[PDB]
């Protein structure tokens, strides 16, 4: 496909256009839940949920690159210590058939801290627990752009909020010509915005076709669930 | 999804977002080839090609029905007399996992001429051969709106033209509001067009999540390949 766009205003439990891995799934309240909390989960648990059809990210014959924009609102819920809750969620591009890996601080995308070009992953993380708990991260909750590694290229301090009472709207735009990836988180209750920009050439990083989706993880003791409220996306090789 | 749209301007030799059944494939010439022709094939033969992602056509909780549009250009090729060349191609909606059924005059969609609701198929056909060759269609080539059967609830005469220099503009719509489906064909060359409109309630025929694709069929001794150049497709639950 050259152009693609799909909007989910809700999420039905009988959906047929989303593949889930780990313990992610749509729930009765029509919410896309990325990770389950409570008992009977491994110490590092989480889930991935991606659009069933692989996106045509770049064309190897024309050399053309596709620009894209995606928006979604998510909220988080925790029972105990919020400031100490792990680990967050992610929006990512990767080979559509990539397995679910290590959860917790690795979000399900990476199996350890070693950076490897073979991941062909580009994720915009919303990390809720950093150093010293998560060594490789800055000393505070934040947002970052992950390129083939759990360690961001660039990041921004995020003062995380929990509860349905604090829904966050995210919007990511990747400008193909300037290779600029910009993601912003905005708490609508008060317009508390934040954004992390970066210049990454997806043509070098990602494969011809990739999946676009989400991932969410937490940790025993510091459990919290991360869930998507809706989603929008639009790809296009043909400029604007 | 709630809203969805894509656009293929041509096709990738190694695509990842299409499902192929029968002898359907993308030829090295970047064209969707619904069916192939040759002495290595059975008497009745064809193929199916669908967008790998199931579309949400209607939602049983709100009783909502989506509206849609699909456009495409196609041409055909044959070593047989156009007059006698079979069988045509269709654009269809049906269970995402519909097995490849009998081809020939049955477009890969039907077992035989018996009308069955268990098909849950809504196709728009571009039939090149009717009676006497096939004891069920009009005695000439035509287009038609098929609902759960290879027998059109409505049809229009179709003066088929062959070859790349005789490509055709099909523009199918479905205004959910009024429950009317309407196919269209325009031969760009001299700007002449035909159509068919038939009120068909998709909610009473198709499952919530259906597939969208094409099919091309042919018969021994009258073999022809049917190919699509491009394919736009949009659908949305918020009317329009
Ligand atoms: C051992 O624990 C470390 O901190 C936890 C909060 C998680 O991020 C886990 O994946 C990481 O390895
Ligand atoms: C003998 O063949 C009949 O006519 C051909 C044109 C095809 O429609 C075939 O499927 C049908 O059985
Ligand atoms: Ca972290
Ligand atoms: Ca026929
Ligand atoms: Mn981080
Ligand atoms: Mn017919």
Short mmCIF file of N, CA, C and O in Angstrom, two decimals, chain A residues 1-12 14-17 51-54 56 59 209 238, chain B residues 1-10 12 14-17 51-54 56 59 208-209 238:
data_model
loop_
_atom_site.label_atom_id
_atom_site.label_comp_id
_atom_site.label_asym_id
_atom_site.label_seq_id
_atom_site.Cartn_x
_atom_site.Cartn_y
_atom_site.Cartn_z
N UNK A 1 0.88 -1.20 0.00
CA UNK A 1 0.00 0.00 0.00
C UNK A 1 0.90 1.22 0.00
O UNK A 1 2.04 1.16 0.45
N UNK A 2 0.39 2.33 -0.51
CA UNK A 2 1.17 3.55 -0.56
C UNK A 2 0.70 4.48 0.55
O UNK A 2 1.51 5.08 1.27
N UNK A 3 -0.62 4.56 0.68
CA UNK A 3 -1.25 5.37 1.70
C UNK A 3 -2.03 4.42 2.57
O UNK A 3 -2.54 3.41 2.09
N UNK A 4 -2.08 4.71 3.85
CA UNK A 4 -2.81 3.87 4.77
C UNK A 4 -3.27 4.75 5.92
O UNK A 4 -2.63 5.75 6.24
N UNK A 5 -4.43 4.43 6.45
CA UNK A 5 -4.97 5.16 7.57
C UNK A 5 -6.11 4.36 8.15
O UNK A 5 -6.88 3.72 7.44
N UNK A 6 -6.16 4.34 9.46
CA UNK A 6 -7.20 3.62 10.15
C UNK A 6 -7.38 4.30 11.49
O UNK A 6 -6.41 4.77 12.11
N UNK A 7 -8.62 4.38 11.93
CA UNK A 7 -8.88 5.02 13.18
C UNK A 7 -9.71 4.10 14.00
O UNK A 7 -10.63 3.49 13.49
N UNK A 8 -9.32 3.94 15.26
CA UNK A 8 -10.05 3.12 16.21
C UNK A 8 -10.54 4.14 17.24
O UNK A 8 -9.74 4.83 17.87
N UNK A 9 -11.86 4.30 17.35
CA UNK A 9 -12.43 5.22 18.32
C UNK A 9 -12.66 4.47 19.63
O UNK A 9 -12.64 5.04 20.72
N UNK A 10 -12.79 3.16 19.47
CA UNK A 10 -13.09 2.22 20.53
C UNK A 10 -12.25 1.02 20.15
O UNK A 10 -11.43 1.10 19.24
N UNK A 11 -12.48 -0.10 20.83
CA UNK A 11 -11.78 -1.34 20.56
C UNK A 11 -12.76 -2.44 20.96
O UNK A 11 -13.14 -2.54 22.12
N UNK A 12 -13.20 -3.24 19.99
CA UNK A 12 -14.14 -4.35 20.27
C UNK A 12 -13.38 -5.63 20.65
O UNK A 12 -12.29 -5.90 20.13
N UNK A 14 -13.98 -8.57 19.87
CA UNK A 14 -14.10 -9.56 18.81
C UNK A 14 -13.36 -9.02 17.59
O UNK A 14 -13.61 -9.43 16.46
N UNK A 15 -12.45 -8.09 17.85
CA UNK A 15 -11.66 -7.48 16.78
C UNK A 15 -10.95 -8.53 15.96
O UNK A 15 -10.71 -9.64 16.43
N UNK A 16 -10.65 -8.20 14.71
CA UNK A 16 -9.97 -9.15 13.85
C UNK A 16 -8.79 -8.53 13.11
O UNK A 16 -8.17 -9.17 12.27
N UNK A 17 -8.46 -7.30 13.46
CA UNK A 17 -7.35 -6.59 12.85
C UNK A 17 -6.20 -6.20 13.80
O UNK A 17 -5.48 -5.22 13.56
N UNK A 51 -1.08 -3.51 14.55
CA UNK A 51 -2.04 -3.59 13.46
C UNK A 51 -1.68 -4.84 12.66
O UNK A 51 -0.51 -5.11 12.37
N UNK A 52 -2.72 -5.62 12.36
CA UNK A 52 -2.59 -6.90 11.66
C UNK A 52 -1.87 -6.83 10.30
O UNK A 52 -1.17 -7.76 9.93
N UNK A 53 -2.02 -5.73 9.60
CA UNK A 53 -1.37 -5.60 8.30
C UNK A 53 -0.08 -4.80 8.39
O UNK A 53 -0.03 -3.74 9.03
N UNK A 54 0.99 -5.31 7.78
CA UNK A 54 2.30 -4.67 7.75
C UNK A 54 2.25 -3.43 6.87
O UNK A 54 1.63 -3.45 5.80
N UNK A 56 3.93 -0.38 4.52
CA UNK A 56 4.98 -0.23 3.51
C UNK A 56 5.75 1.02 3.97
O UNK A 56 5.34 2.14 3.71
N UNK A 59 10.34 2.29 -0.04
CA UNK A 59 10.40 1.60 -1.32
C UNK A 59 11.83 1.47 -1.84
O UNK A 59 12.45 2.47 -2.21
N UNK A 209 8.91 -3.46 4.99
CA UNK A 209 7.58 -3.50 5.56
C UNK A 209 7.73 -3.69 7.06
O UNK A 209 8.56 -4.47 7.52
N UNK A 238 3.47 9.32 -0.81
CA UNK A 238 3.34 10.45 -1.70
C UNK A 238 3.21 11.86 -1.13
O UNK A 238 2.25 12.61 -1.38
N UNK B 1 -11.14 -1.74 12.76
CA UNK B 1 -11.02 -0.27 12.94
C UNK B 1 -12.37 0.39 12.67
O UNK B 1 -13.31 -0.28 12.24
N UNK B 2 -12.48 1.67 12.97
CA UNK B 2 -13.72 2.39 12.73
C UNK B 2 -13.69 2.89 11.30
O UNK B 2 -14.61 2.63 10.52
N UNK B 3 -12.61 3.59 10.96
CA UNK B 3 -12.41 4.15 9.63
C UNK B 3 -11.18 3.48 9.07
O UNK B 3 -10.25 3.16 9.81
N UNK B 4 -11.15 3.26 7.76
CA UNK B 4 -10.00 2.65 7.13
C UNK B 4 -9.94 3.01 5.67
O UNK B 4 -10.96 3.22 5.03
N UNK B 5 -8.72 3.18 5.17
CA UNK B 5 -8.50 3.48 3.77
C UNK B 5 -7.06 3.20 3.41
O UNK B 5 -6.16 3.27 4.26
N UNK B 6 -6.86 2.74 2.18
CA UNK B 6 -5.54 2.45 1.68
C UNK B 6 -5.54 2.75 0.21
O UNK B 6 -6.58 3.04 -0.37
N UNK B 7 -4.37 2.68 -0.40
CA UNK B 7 -4.28 3.00 -1.80
C UNK B 7 -3.05 2.37 -2.38
O UNK B 7 -1.95 2.60 -1.90
N UNK B 8 -3.26 1.52 -3.37
CA UNK B 8 -2.17 0.86 -4.06
C UNK B 8 -2.08 1.57 -5.40
O UNK B 8 -3.07 1.60 -6.13
N UNK B 9 -0.94 2.18 -5.70
CA UNK B 9 -0.75 2.84 -6.99
C UNK B 9 -0.22 1.87 -8.05
O UNK B 9 -0.29 2.12 -9.25
N UNK B 10 0.26 0.73 -7.57
CA UNK B 10 0.81 -0.37 -8.36
C UNK B 10 1.16 -1.43 -7.32
O UNK B 10 0.93 -1.20 -6.13
N UNK B 12 3.83 -4.39 -5.33
CA UNK B 12 5.18 -4.84 -5.00
C UNK B 12 5.43 -6.30 -5.27
O UNK B 12 4.65 -7.15 -4.86
N UNK B 14 7.26 -8.23 -3.87
CA UNK B 14 7.31 -8.98 -2.62
C UNK B 14 6.51 -8.32 -1.49
O UNK B 14 6.98 -8.19 -0.35
N UNK B 15 5.26 -8.00 -1.81
CA UNK B 15 4.38 -7.35 -0.87
C UNK B 15 4.18 -8.13 0.41
O UNK B 15 4.50 -9.31 0.48
N UNK B 16 3.60 -7.49 1.41
CA UNK B 16 3.38 -8.14 2.69
C UNK B 16 1.97 -7.93 3.25
O UNK B 16 1.57 -8.56 4.23
N UNK B 17 1.19 -7.08 2.57
CA UNK B 17 -0.15 -6.77 3.04
C UNK B 17 -1.29 -7.36 2.22
O UNK B 17 -2.43 -6.91 2.35
N UNK B 51 -6.81 -7.75 0.88
CA UNK B 51 -5.99 -6.90 1.75
C UNK B 51 -5.90 -7.69 3.05
O UNK B 51 -6.92 -7.95 3.69
N UNK B 52 -4.70 -8.07 3.43
CA UNK B 52 -4.48 -8.91 4.60
C UNK B 52 -5.26 -8.55 5.87
O UNK B 52 -5.49 -9.41 6.72
N UNK B 53 -5.73 -7.32 5.97
CA UNK B 53 -6.46 -6.92 7.16
C UNK B 53 -7.99 -6.88 7.03
O UNK B 53 -8.55 -6.19 6.16
N UNK B 54 -8.69 -7.63 7.90
CA UNK B 54 -10.15 -7.69 7.92
C UNK B 54 -10.71 -6.32 8.23
O UNK B 54 -10.22 -5.60 9.11
N UNK B 56 -13.89 -3.84 9.41
CA UNK B 56 -15.05 -3.86 10.28
C UNK B 56 -16.19 -3.27 9.45
O UNK B 56 -16.27 -2.04 9.26
N UNK B 59 -21.05 -3.25 13.18
CA UNK B 59 -20.84 -3.57 14.59
C UNK B 59 -22.15 -3.87 15.34
O UNK B 59 -22.93 -2.96 15.64
N UNK B 208 -19.52 -9.25 10.79
CA UNK B 208 -18.96 -7.98 11.23
C UNK B 208 -17.63 -7.65 10.56
O UNK B 208 -17.46 -6.56 10.04
N UNK B 209 -16.69 -8.60 10.58
CA UNK B 209 -15.37 -8.40 9.97
C UNK B 209 -15.26 -9.24 8.70
O UNK B 209 -15.31 -10.48 8.75
N UNK B 238 -18.54 6.53 10.33
CA UNK B 238 -19.12 7.83 10.56
C UNK B 238 -19.59 8.27 9.20
O UNK B 238 -18.95 9.10 8.55
#
